[PDB]
């Protein structure tokens, strides 16, 4: 019975926003003559996940999206700001909530399940556009604080909600506020009554928060319509000059590394590696120490063509100098305490320390590699 359900649904959220306008004004209440705590909690919670609030909330929708069927626990409501005030036991509170919602119209409840289920699923984005059409943009509000006066005096057209920002700007009532109307037809009716405002004045300047400055009483769609050109000009403008951006981005990744990122002592050179030994075996031999290192397989002895002297030498760049010293202790082969190691069945020679000029040049081409790593992505992005 979707046709029943759709009409059944439309009644509910109407009853919901109906209560919200009343409770903020405290117009009606059942007090304690006939309990009605069940109706109070009902209004509270299915407002807590009413369409308008979730439009403002945008969080409980996510938390129910976490659940597979989106059925959610009662316990989550007990932590809420103005729910616990019922007071007077969680094992009893769950039963109370359950038999309070057992006749509810938007929450499926049955077999004492630990979960609650809103009877209409997701439809978040669709409500966003419908509400956006129903909403209206206000930009003529002087900083005077007359929120209660505003809501009591705007009883001229059917309004879903008034979104007045609090403390976003200075003092309490500085923001330009947001107002939604009962329907798109209601918003169009409010527009037909040209600049619908307080009855004593609707087109001229007046007092209080609705003092009616530059009278920008238009709905959300034309608010974005007037946004469009001004926002798009700034957003587009002109593309950034891509010629010097990579050169600017060089500095930190290039010219400080040898003493800021990896100290010069962390670099250890290896020589006399026979040809025919793949670098995988060499990096495995270095991994035998267990520390973390960067291996620069030295085939280009010029250190910045396919260099003919392949696999002759190797360069190891540790992360930390102390780890490098620990590796030196490990590379201090306890059988002979010789700065050497065997790879692929052949013993090769290692260098513990390299002259600082060669270390600086090696770091220079390392930073060149880093710069070109940053250049590839930068040229890739510069066309977008």
């Amino acid at each position: 019975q979707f046709q029943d359900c759709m009409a059944h649904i439309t009644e509910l959220n109407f009853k919901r926003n109906y209560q919200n306008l009343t409770e903020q004004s405290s117009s009606n209440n059942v007090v304690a003559e006939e309990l009605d705590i069940k109706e109070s909690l009902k209004l509270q919670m299915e407002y807590y996940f009413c369409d308008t609030n979730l439009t403002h909330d945008s969080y409980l929708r996510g938390i129910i999206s976490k659940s597979p069927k989106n059925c959610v626990d009662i316990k989550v409501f007990l932590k809420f700001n103005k729910i616990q005030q019922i007071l007077k036991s969680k094992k009893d509170l769950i039963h109370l909530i359950r038999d309070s919602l057992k006749e509810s119209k938007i929450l499926k409840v049955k077999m004492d399940s630990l979960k609650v289920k809103r009877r209409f699923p997701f439809n978040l984005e669709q409500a966003l556009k419908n509400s956006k059409q129903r909403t209206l943009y206000i930009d003529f509000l002087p900083p005077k604080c007359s929120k209660q006066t505003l809501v009591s005096i705007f009883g001229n057209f059917r309004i879903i909600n008034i979104n007045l920002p609090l403390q976003k700007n200075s003092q309490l009532c500085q923001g330009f506020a947001f107002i939604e109307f009962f329907s798109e037809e209601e918003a169009n009716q409010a527009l037909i009554t040209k600049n619908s405002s307080i009855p004593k004045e609707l087109i001229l300047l007046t007092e209080k928060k609705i003092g009616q400055g530059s009278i920008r009483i238009i709905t959300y769609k034309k608010w974005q319509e007037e946004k469009q050109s001004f926002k798009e000009l700034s957003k587009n403008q002109n593309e950034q000059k891509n010629k010097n951006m990579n050169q600017s981005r060089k500095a930190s990744d290039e010219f400080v590394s040898i003493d800021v990122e990896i100290k010069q002592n962390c670099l250890i050179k290896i020589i006399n590696i026979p040809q025919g030994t793949l670098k995988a075996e060499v990096v495995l031999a270095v991994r035998h120490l267990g520390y973390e290192f960067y291996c620069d397989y030295i085939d280009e002895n010029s250190n910045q063509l396919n260099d003919l002297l392949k696999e002759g030498q190797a360069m190891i760049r540790f992360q930390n100098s102390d780890e490098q010293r620990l590796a030196i202790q490990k590379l201090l082969n306890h059988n002979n305490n010789k700065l050497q190691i065997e790879i692929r069945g052949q013993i090769c020679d290692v260098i513990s320390t390299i002259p600082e000029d060669e270390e600086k040049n090696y770091w220079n081409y390392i930073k060149f590699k880093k710069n070109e790593f940053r250049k590839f992505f930068f040229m890739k992005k510069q066309q977008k």
Binding site: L284, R287, H288, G290
Partner: protein, 1012 residues
């Protein structure tokens, strides 16, 4: 498409084997080698022998044996000399037919064993063959070729060449096995709950004692270093210390406690035991039921085991997550069935290696070779799992519980507390002593039989209101030089009585033993009923209660002594039989061998020295074939002799001095023969056949005295009788009652199922409880009294079905295991009653429908278990079925091929080779559609199969329906050509198809086949 045929030729089958390159008969080989010419004349018998003899070789050697003009062919040596020369030339090779029963010593050959095939080798036909061939060519022909000679209508005997059985033949770690079977049937009881005093838990009261008692795990090779062993030793010490602090009484009282009226039950049992007079039957039955309703639940026992494990084993031994995984899998292990078991991989594949913190590696392989490190630590994790289980869980269950299965509950497992089982054992002993068992003393039994025969053990299975004793004879006495059990001692007499069973079938009574005999008797009776003209039928069903115990030993001995069907002396022959399987012949990917087409079976036979008609001395085998397909037999060199006196001594000993033990208390039977011996069924059948032939004289002449059709069969102690005369049925009942009264036996429950109603007062049958039903039920089979059709009886609930299914799955041979299991499940019972001479087309369709509906529910747990393993992690299956829907593809392939094979077998069974291929294909398509529709309807609701698989199965079903419709449409045009003349069976099939209107759809036949 390829179809199975009832008639096949050995040469045609052999030509389909790729290994053999040259296959031909002897005559054509001789003509090709030009040893003989067509113009030459020979004896008719020799010509027939040459034509029938079949030879084969791995290569083409016609040129090698080409006739040579250098020297003619004249023979001067003996055939034995030529054979000896060939055997000597064979040398060290030890797999040839001619070497059977003989040995070679230098250039001398020695015969020491009996070979029945040597007669063919030394026959005059082979003498003339040698005369034609020549010595030098014969000696090599006996080696280069495989010689097969026809000795029966379709049988062949290999006499030379390599033995056919030779064609039917870097390591990896194998994890240990959980000894789950040790839990069952433990009758021991101890003053304090816990474990056995022999266990290391109790033996200790330092690390020295624990090391001494647990060396088998301490010095394992999986440990990398001594530090790992020391850590494991410390963990074992901590476990032992923690174990002694467990309040077993409190745990039992909390989780699995005794019933409230346990004291009342104990008092009742004691009163019954102490009472001198016979106890009340209904009171004893109520006590039995009350005792049996005290079983413990799976959840209760799981909670008990989890509580025991948690406070006894340190959590860091396995890891935080691995401990929880093990605890969770413990329930699954607990609820696991009787002939089913778990595997170490079921735990290893779900826990994490790196969770363990105390693991240490001598070499830093954690980052270099992660896979090698993982394997090395898995080798230790599995050892830890096996140690924990087999050292804590199994001993506790064995000591503190008696675990067994009920009578009619199938393979389902049940648990009972030990004192309850002690009470049950006492009550069962009291019941058996009054009836058939007596306490015995070793003084009475002669020492000869005492040292010559082993004793048996007694086991009791719970039953509704009673028990069911089972005695076993597996044990053998280590002392007194005994190496065999009773069955191994008596299997010679078992062979002799199995030979007796053949003439026991029809000569001296109404006894049946197999569904083939039942089916042929039913077919003959159905044909006679058809000849009579379909008159009304009545049936009676009754059975004997405790037939084995109601056997008179003196009467049995007298029958054995005076029976002339048992000869004085017999000889035992052993041979190997090769028989065609149910696989159609491939038509000519390259590796085709004998096992693809033949099944190897080992057979023994006992034969007499008389000049019998079957002349077993000439052949060495006695086999019955239901088809014309050929088979091959090769003899063996292990003969044995058995004498009637030995059988007499064995029968006397088992009848008089049968001794069994129970709770270290010896007992002895007083009447009858013990059930469970390999000869018990045959002996019982013969003994009761004597009395029934004594008392059923009138049936011998009734069918011609007044021309009344009547059928009587007896399977063991169960009787079934269908006739046309209510007077005949009543006379049979009266005669059986008289025979029972005279011979001192009775029928079960005083209950009889009939198709009619008669006054029991006239025939003194008042004590009988006659039950009237319009549908007969016999040995689990359902028979119609209107159409005289037979179909099996199937269960109706998945709970009933699952109780009789044992699931065992190994990743190594998933495809083969599943295919064979499904094949066996489909062909278990349907093949034995799919005879077209019994049912019509509609009956066959209904039988197949119901059998398939049963089998799909039977097999469902197998794919439920299969889905627990993801094949995408196995290369062997991923390379073949992708990585996305590996399980679905594997299941689809298995189901498709199994269904196709079953349909082919069903068509072969239903139709003969003379029927039209179009009819065969149409029926195969119809059967395939039925099977696939049943499977799809069953599986369309399951959640695991809800998605990808259902579309494929629906596509297969639609394809089968389309193919069936297309074949039906094309058959009309095929027959309209007038090129074929239809026989009566083809006309019947055409009429059936046209009546059911298979051209359009299937909705007409479904109500007729799905009726229940």
């Amino acid at each position: 498409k390829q179809m199975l045929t009832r008639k096949e030729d050995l040469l045609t089958v052999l030509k389909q084997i790729s290994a053999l390159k040259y296959v031909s008969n002897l005559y054509e080989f001789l003509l090709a080698t030009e040893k003989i010419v067509q113009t030459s004349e020979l004896d008719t018998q020799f010509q027939e022998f040459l034509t029938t003899t079949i030879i084969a070789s791995e290569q083409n050697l016609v040129e090698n044996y080409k006739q040579k003009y250098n020297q003619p062919n004249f023979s001067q040596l003996t055939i034995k000399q030529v054979i000896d020369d060939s055997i000597i030339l064979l040398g060290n090779k030890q797999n040839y037919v001619q070497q059977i029963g003989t040995t070679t010593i230098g250039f001398y050959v020695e015969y020491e064993n009996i070979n029945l095939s040597r007669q063919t080798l030394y026959s005059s036909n082979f003498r003339n063959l040698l005369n034609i061939f020549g010595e030098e060519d014969f000696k090599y022909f006996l080696i280069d070729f495989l010689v097969f000679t026809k000795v029966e209508q379709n049988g062949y005997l290999q006499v030379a060449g390599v033995c056919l059985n030779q064609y039917f033949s870097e390591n990896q770690y194998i994890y240990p096995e959980i000894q789950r079977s040790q839990i069952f049937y433990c009758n021991h009881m101890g003053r304090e709950p816990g474990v056995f005093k022999s266990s290391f838990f109790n033996y200790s009261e330092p690390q020295t004692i624990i090391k001494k008692t647990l060396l088998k795990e301490y010095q394992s090779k999986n440990f990398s270093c001594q530090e790992e062993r020391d850590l494991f030793l410390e963990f074992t010490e901590k476990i032992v210390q923690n174990f002694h602090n467990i309040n077993f009484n409190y745990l039992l009282k909390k989780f699995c406690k005794l019933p409230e009226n346990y004291q009342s039950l104990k008092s009742q049992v004691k009163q019954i035991v102490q009472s001198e007079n016979k106890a009340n039957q209904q009171s004893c039955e109520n006590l039995f039921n009350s005792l049996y309703d005290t079983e413990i639940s799976y959840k209760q026992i799981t909670n008990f085991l989890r509580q025991i494990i948690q406070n006894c084993v340190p959590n860091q031994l396995l890891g935080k997550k691995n401990f929880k995984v093990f605890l969770e899998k413990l329930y699954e292990f607990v609820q696991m069935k009787r002939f089913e078991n778990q595997k170490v991989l079921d735990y290893i594949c779900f826990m994490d290696v790196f969770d363990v913190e105390w693991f240490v590696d001598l070499k830093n392989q954690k980052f270099t070779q992660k896979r090698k490190y993982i394997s090395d630590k898995r080798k230790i994790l599995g050892d830890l799992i096996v140690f924990i289980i087999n050292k804590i869980v199994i001993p506790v269950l064995r000591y503190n519980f008696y675990i067994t299965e009920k009578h009619k509950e199938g393979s389902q497992i049940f648990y009972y507390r030990k004192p309850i089982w002690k009470l049950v054992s006492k009550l069962t002993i009291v019941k058996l002593e009054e009836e058939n068992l007596e306490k015995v003393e070793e003084k009475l039994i002669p020492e000869d039989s005492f040292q010559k025969y082993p004793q048996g053990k007694l086991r009791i299975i719970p039953k509704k209101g009673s028990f069911r004793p089972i005695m076993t004879f597996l044990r053998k006495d280590k002392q007194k030089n005994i190496k065999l059990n009773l069955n191994q001692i008596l299997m010679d007499s078992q062979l002799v009585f199995r030979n007796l069973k053949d003439m026991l079938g029809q000569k001296i009574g109404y006894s049946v033993f197999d569904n083939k005999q039942i089916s042929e008797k039913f077919a003959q009776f159905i044909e006679k009923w058809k000849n009579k003209g379909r008159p009304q039928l009545y049936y009676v069903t009754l059975d004997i209660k405790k037939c084995y115990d109601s056997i008179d030993q003196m009467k049995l001995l007298n029958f054995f002594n005076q029976s002339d069907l048992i000869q004085d002396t017999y000889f035992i022959n052993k041979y190997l039989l090769f028989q065609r399987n149910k696989r159609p012949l491939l038509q000519i990917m390259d590796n085709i061998n004998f096992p693809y087409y033949f099944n190897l079976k080992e057979r023994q036979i006992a034969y007499s020295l008389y000049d019998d008609d079957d002349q077993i001395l000439q052949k060495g085998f006695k086999e019955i074939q239901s088809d014309d397909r050929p088979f091959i037999v090769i003899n063996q060199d292990k003969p044995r002799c058995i004498t009637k006196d030995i059988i007499h001594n064995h029968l006397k000993h088992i009848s008089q001095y049968n001794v069994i033990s129970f709770n270290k208390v010896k007992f002895r039977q007083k009447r009858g023969i013990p059930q469970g011996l390999n000869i018990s069924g045959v002996l019982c059948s013969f003994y009761f056949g004597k009395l029934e032939e004594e008392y059923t004289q009138f049936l011998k002449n009734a069918e011609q005295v007044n021309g009344s059709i009547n059928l009587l069969m007896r399977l063991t102690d169960d009787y079934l009788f269908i006739s046309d005369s209510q007077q005949n049925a009543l006379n049979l009942i009266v005669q059986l009652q008289n025979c029972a009264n005279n011979n001192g036996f009775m029928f079960n429950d005083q209950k009889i199922t009939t198709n009619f109603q008669f006054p029991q007062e006239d025939y003194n049958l008042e004590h009988f409880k006659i039950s009237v039903q319009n549908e007969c039920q016999w040995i689990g089979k359902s028979i119609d009294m209107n159409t005289l059709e037979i179909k099996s009886i199937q269960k109706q609930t998945q709970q009933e079905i699952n109780q009789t299914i044992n699931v065992a799955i190994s990743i190594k041979n998933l495809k083969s295991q599943l295919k064979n299991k499904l094949r066996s499940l489909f062909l278990n019972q349907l093949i034995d009653y799919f005879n077209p001479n019994i049912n019509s087309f509609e009956g066959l369709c209904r039988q197949l429908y119901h059998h398939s509906k049963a089998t799909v529910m039977k097999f469902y747990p197998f794919m439920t278990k299969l889905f627990q393993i993801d094949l995408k992690k196995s290369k062997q299956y991923s390379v073949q079925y992708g990585k996305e829907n590996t399980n679905e593809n594997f299941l689809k392939d298995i189901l498709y091929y199994t269904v196709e094979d079953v349909c082919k077998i069903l068509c072969y069974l239903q139709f003969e080779d003379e029927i039209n291929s179009n009819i065969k294909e149409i029926f195969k398509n119809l059967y395939s559609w039925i099977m696939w529709d049943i499977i799809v309807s069953y599986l369309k609701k399951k959640k695991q199969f809800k998605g990808y698989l259902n579309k494929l199965l629906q596509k297969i079903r639609k394809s089968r329906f389309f193919y069936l419709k297309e074949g039906c449409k094309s058959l009309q045009l095929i027959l309209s050509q007038q090129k074929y003349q239809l026989n009566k069976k083809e006309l019947e099939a055409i009429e059936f198809i046209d009546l059911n209107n298979l051209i359009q759809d299937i909705k007409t036949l479904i109500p007729k086949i799905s009726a229940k």
